Amino acid sequence: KPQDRLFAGQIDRMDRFALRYRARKYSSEQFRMPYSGLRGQRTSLIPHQLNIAHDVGRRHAPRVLLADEVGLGKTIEAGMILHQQLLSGAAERVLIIVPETLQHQWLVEMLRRFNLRFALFDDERYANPFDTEQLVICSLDFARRSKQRLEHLCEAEWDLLVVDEAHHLVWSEDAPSREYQAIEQLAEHVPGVLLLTATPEQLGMESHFARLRLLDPNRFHDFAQFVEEQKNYRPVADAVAMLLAGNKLSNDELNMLGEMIGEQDIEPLLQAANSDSEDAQSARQELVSMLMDRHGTSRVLFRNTRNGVKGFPKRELHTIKLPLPTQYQTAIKVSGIMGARKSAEDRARDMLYPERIYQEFEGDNATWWNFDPRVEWLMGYLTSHRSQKVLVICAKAATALQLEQVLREREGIRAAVFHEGMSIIERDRAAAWFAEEDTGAQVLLCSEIGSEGRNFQFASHMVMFDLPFNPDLLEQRIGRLDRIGQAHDIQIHVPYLEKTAQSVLVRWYHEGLDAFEHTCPTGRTIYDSVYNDLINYLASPDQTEGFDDLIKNCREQHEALKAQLEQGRDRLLEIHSNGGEKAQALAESIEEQDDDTNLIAFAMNLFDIIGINQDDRGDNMIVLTPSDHMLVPDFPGLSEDGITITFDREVALAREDAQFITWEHPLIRNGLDLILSGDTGSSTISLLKNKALPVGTLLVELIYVVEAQAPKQLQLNRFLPPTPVRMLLDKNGNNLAAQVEFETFNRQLNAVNRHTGSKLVNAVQQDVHAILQLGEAQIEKSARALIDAARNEADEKLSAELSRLEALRAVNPNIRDDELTAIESNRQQVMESLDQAGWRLDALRLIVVTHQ
Numbered sequence: 001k002p003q004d005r006l007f008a009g010q011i012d013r014m015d016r017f018a019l020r021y022r023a024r025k026y027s028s029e030q031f032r033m034p035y036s037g038l039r040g041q042r043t044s045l046i047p048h049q050l051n052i053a054h055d056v057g058r059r060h061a062p063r064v065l066l067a068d069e070v071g072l073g074k075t076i077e078a079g080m081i082l083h084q085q086l087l088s089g090a091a092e093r094v095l096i097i098v099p100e101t102l103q104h105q106w107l108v109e110m111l112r113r114f115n116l117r118f119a120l121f122d123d124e125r126y127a128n129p130f131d132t133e134q135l136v137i138c139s140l141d142f143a144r145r146s147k148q149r150l151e152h153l154c155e156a157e158w159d160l161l162v163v164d165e166a167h168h169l170v171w172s173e174d175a176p177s178r179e180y181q182a183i184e185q186l187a188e189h190v191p192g193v194l195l196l197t198a199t200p201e202q203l204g205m206e207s208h209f210a211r212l213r214l215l216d217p218n219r220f221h222d223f224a225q226f227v228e229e230q231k232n233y234r235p236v237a238d239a240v241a242m243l244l245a246g247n248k249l250s251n252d253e254l255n256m257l258g259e260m261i262g263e264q265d266i267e268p269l270l271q272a273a274n275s276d277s278e279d280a281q282s283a284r285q286e287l288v289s290m291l292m293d294r295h296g297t298s299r300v301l302f303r304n305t306r307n308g309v310k311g312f313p314k315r316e317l318h319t320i321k322l323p324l325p326t327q328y329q330t331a332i333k334v335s336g337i338m339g340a341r342k343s344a345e346d347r348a349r350d351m352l353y354p355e356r357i358y359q360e361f362e363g364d365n366a367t368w369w370n371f372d373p374r375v376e377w378l379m380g381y382l383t384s385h386r387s388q389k390v391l392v393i394c395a396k397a398a399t400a401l402q403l404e405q406v407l408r409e410r411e412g413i414r415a416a417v418f419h420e421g422m423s424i425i426e427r428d429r430a431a432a433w434f435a436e437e438d439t440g441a442q443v444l445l446c447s448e449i450g451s452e453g454r455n456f457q458f459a460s461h462m463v464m465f466d467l468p469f470n471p472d473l474l475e476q477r478i479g480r481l482d483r484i485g486q487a488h489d490i491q492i493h494v495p496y497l498e499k500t501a502q503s504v505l506v507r508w509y510h511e512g513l514d515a516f517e518h519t520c521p522t523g524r525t526i527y528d529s530v531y532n533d534l535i536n537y538l539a540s541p542d543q544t545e546g547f548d549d550l551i552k553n554c555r556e557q558h559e560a561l562k563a564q565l566e567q568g569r570d571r572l573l574e575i576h577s578n579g580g581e582k583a584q585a586l587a588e589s590i591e592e593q594d595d596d597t598n599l600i601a602f603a604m605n606l607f608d609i610i611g612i613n614q615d616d617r618g619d620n621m622i623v624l625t626p627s628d629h630m631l632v633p634d635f636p637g638l639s640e641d642g643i644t645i646t647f648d649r650e651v652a653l654a655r656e657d658a659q660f661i662t663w664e665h666p667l668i669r670n671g672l673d674l675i676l677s678g679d680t681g682s683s684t685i686s687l688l689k690n691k692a693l694p695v696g697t698l699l700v701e702l703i704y705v706v707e708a709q710a711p712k713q714l715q716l717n718r719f720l721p722p723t724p725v726r727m728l729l730d731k732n733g734n735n736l737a738a739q740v741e742f743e744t745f746n747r748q749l750n751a752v753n754r755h756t757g758s759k760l761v762n763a764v765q766q767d768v769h770a771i772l773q774l775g776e777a778q779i780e781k782s783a784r785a786l787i788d789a790a791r792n793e794a795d796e797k798l799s800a801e802l803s804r805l806e807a808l809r810a811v812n813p814n815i816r817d818d819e820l821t822a823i824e825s826n827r828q829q830v831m832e833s834l835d836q837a838g839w840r841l842d843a844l845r846l847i848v849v850t851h852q
């Protein structure tokens with residue numbers, strides 16, 4: 001094929017040949033690396049997250065509970081797992097079931113951090129229809145709405161299922177939820193399952209066990225036995241955990257340990273660890289790993305905690321008590337007198353957002369913002385903090401929009417607005433404007449959706465124009481800025497109107513739950529426990545008999561539950577969930593990759609040759625725009641509006657509007673596919689100025705490709721991706737390639753006029769044919785060596801992993817049958833597909849020695 005082009009007179013420019021060869025070499029090498037699938041995401045490199053993702057993401061059909069505490073990165077961990085599985089080919093179809101109001105947050109996270117475009121399925125967009133899309137997000141309610149729909153989902157042949165906030169799957173002996181039942185049915189037909197929930201087990205042990213049974217109903221079949229085994233385990237594991245903290249062990253703990261591990265002699269290991277010797281610490285970390293292989297929830301549950309990971313800011317509450325204006329006092333009394341009585345909730349909501357009462361009787365569009373002291377306080381705060389990036393949160397979009405107008409007209413400060421009525425692209429623009437340094441918006445006004453999952457590293461100040469109606473929404477608001485890696489303490493300003501539901505609720509959240517300044521896993525439990533009572537205080541804030549006691553009771557419940565949670569921590573599992581030194585090393589290794597000058601040089605040459613225009617902005621960023629004369633009509637991922645790119649991870653994290661270019665980015669992969677599936681650079685001729693060789697000497701640079709045809713799911717690329725084999729032959733068939741390195745030789749060559757070129761080739765066409773014949777014999781030898789080596793490394797690696805899981809099963813009940821059968825079956829189909837591998841000539845460059 002490539003020789004046919006050359007002789008038909010079709011001669012590419014030399015630089016195209018070099019680009020083609022580099023593209024093959026690079027793509028064949030970036031497939032066989034340990035951190036593959038953990039580079040391309042727009043995230044910081046946090047060890048505990050990478051620990052989970054690298055462990056879970058490389059398994060066959062992962063079935064796990066991701067139970068990290070709030071803010072630790074359960075969404076990011078799920079993303080890295082999906083990213084790895086979809087890049088490697090282990091998965092192709094993914095379903096993500098989330099709570100109703102979280103769909104857009106997930107859609108943006110998957111696309112903007114993992115370059116994965118999920119299709120949103122709801123009833124408005126579609127009143128089976130799931131074969132249409134490979135990546136689907138929908139709500140839990142949507143998925144369980146009808147029995148027809150559920151069965152549609154089960155038969156849609158999903159590879160992986162992700163269920164966010166899985167504590168909504170509630171179970172009971174006599175009436176499990178519809179939610180639970182729906183996931184129970186789906187989990188039987190999807191091989192891989194990720195359940196995400198931070199809910200501590202002490203608040204629902206039974207439901208916790210039910211979720212584990214969704215993952216492995218075979219192993220998790222006896223609630224009582226499971227609890228008993230965990231209870232007997234804690235004594236062992238608590239001590240060992242106190243040893244990784246360096247408090248030496250007893251003689252009691254030493255026989256319990258020798259027994260807990262009867263599969264081998266650990267007397268040396270124990271003698272070391274339980275002593276003040278320089279070999280004591282490593283003896284401890286190894287013991288910890290042995291205990292975790294025997295853990296009851298080993299391999300299935302990952303629970304990192306904020307106490308352990310410790311990268312989170314302090315939270316500081318600043319309340320401002322403001323006088324209640326006569327206009328609102330009047331409206332409250334009028335409503336109590338002339339009021340068509342409403343629900344408890346609706347009266348409370350009226351008292352929490354008093355502008356709603358005022359608008360009811362003065363008509364909507366009444367200028368509440370002209371006398372509401374919260375508005376005046378906000379104007380004052382913002383005009384004296386003009387250089388502070390401030391996140392301002394209201395419950396309702398209409399309130400945020402009304403504030404934007406006031407702030408602009410009365411003080412000339414332009415705020416970005418963020419609410420669910422706006423399109424994704426509209427929120428993208430508002431987000432970029434708020435993130436813009438020095439020239440951008442100083443304020444982001446949000447409805448209850450906050451800032452979704454977008455990072456504003458520079459924002460540490462938050463104003464709650466009003467308060468949310470329940471504690472889950474409160475923590476979600478604070479979680480917009482209380483994020484891992486935020487250095488500056490969060491200042492939470494709460495201006496509130498005295499003698500209203502606002503003052504009641506601010507006191508309840510703060511004094512009852514301590515929910516502002518400390519992350520509160522107790523909030524929902526206490527709220528539901530006192531709901532009726534609290535709602536009446538909110539509905540009648542001027543009738544507060546017994547409120548002081550409610551506060552006292554609620555705080556006592558909060559402290560009691562906090563104590564239970566502290567006492568019930570599995571501190572061994574917490575340590576093991578962070579990943580230790582192996583996880584730190586994995587993060588360090590990925591970061592070493594990041595500084596890849598090869599990729600930057602390759603990508604520029606690639607885009608240039610494809611025909612994409614490149615404008616440099618100086619700030620580690622470049623603007624890419626389509627051109628008239630590009631290799632293809634429309635390059636996927638490239639709009640006529642252009643795209644901003646960066647190759648630097650820290651820039652990409654600060655500029656969420658820019659693409660983060662890595663070997664794993666679709667632009668590179670699409671770019672490689674374009675060049676390598678086509679003719680570009682496959683046929684050329686060059687001159688070599690060299691007087692130490694006879695003039696007219698002919699050299700043929702041959703690039704063969706060795707590749708095995710197989711389904712992507714087999715993941716042959718781990719062992720034999722399409723691999724180039726470069727030969728450099730003379731007339732006698734001597735292959736010089738082993739001692740003539742490609743780059744050094746490539747530099748020594750000269751381009752030649754294409755017309756003069758096609759004349760040189762025709763003059764030596766027959767010599768070339770003979771050389772090509774000599775190459776075919778040598779490629780068979782080379783390809784057979786490459787193939788046999790890969791077939792053997794597949795044997796070694798895959799048999800090694802099957803042995804590792806069989807050895808784990810001897811001590812661990814959580815290794816599943818289908819896991820061992822999957823490795824076994826894959827080791828077989830991989831070896832067979834390689835022994836059908838083939839080769840072909842991909843490119844050639846003729847080289848003619850001159851002396852001139």
Ligand SMILES: Nc1ncnc2c1ncn2[C@@H]1O[C@H](COP(=O)(O)OP(=O)(O)O)[C@@H](O)[C@H]1O
Pocket residue numbers: 042043044045046049068069070071072073074075076077109452453454455483484
């Ligand atoms: N490694 C990371 N790099 C960048 N952003 C991160 C990282 N980890 C978490 N975040 C951000 O922190 C926020 C919380 O992440 P998330 O996974 O939703 O926490 P949760 O465990 O409560 O579900 C999100 O906005 C996410 O984008």
Ligand SMILES: [Cl-]
Pocket residue numbers: 036037057058084085088
């Ligand atoms: Cl992988």
Ligand SMILES: [Cl-]
Pocket residue numbers: 085086087088089090091092
């Ligand atoms: Cl895929």
Ligand SMILES: [Cl-]
Pocket residue numbers: 322323324325326371372373
């Ligand atoms: Cl006032």
Ligand SMILES: [Cl-]
Pocket residue numbers: 454455456457459480481483
């Ligand atoms: Cl942020």
Ligand SMILES: [Mg+2]
Pocket residue numbers: 074075164
């Ligand atoms: Mg979450």
